[PDB]
Design a protein around this ligand. Structure first.
Ligand SMILES: [Cl-]
Length: 91
């Protein structure tokens, strides 16, 4: 598998500045809509990143609601371990 990557976010006045988006039916929580100039952007989060851990807890087998709770639980910073999306395909 692709080497996961650690992103360490510092909570700003309007939160982190990203959407957490699920699939409906099949598991997996993905980052979307990383807002320009946000803490998420500055921490290196990318749209299409698959979220593997929140503060060192694997969240691959957690519901959307549980993952949101884990991110919101953190007082002023959150560590997110992600797997970045593929950028090269041969056709
Ligand atoms: Cl991905």
């Amino acid at each position: 598998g692709m080497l996961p990557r650690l992103c360490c976010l510092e909570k700003g006045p309007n939160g982190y500045g990203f959407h957490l988006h699920g699939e409906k039916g099949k598991l997996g929580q993905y980052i979307r809509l990383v807002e320009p100039g946000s803490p998420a952007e500055k921490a290196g989060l990318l749209a299409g990143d698959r979220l593997v851990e929140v503060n060192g807890e694997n969240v691959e087998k957690e519901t959307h609601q549980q993952v949101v709770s884990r991110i919101r639980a953190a007082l002023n910073a959150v560590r997110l371990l992600v797997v970045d999306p593929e950028t090269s395909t041969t056709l």
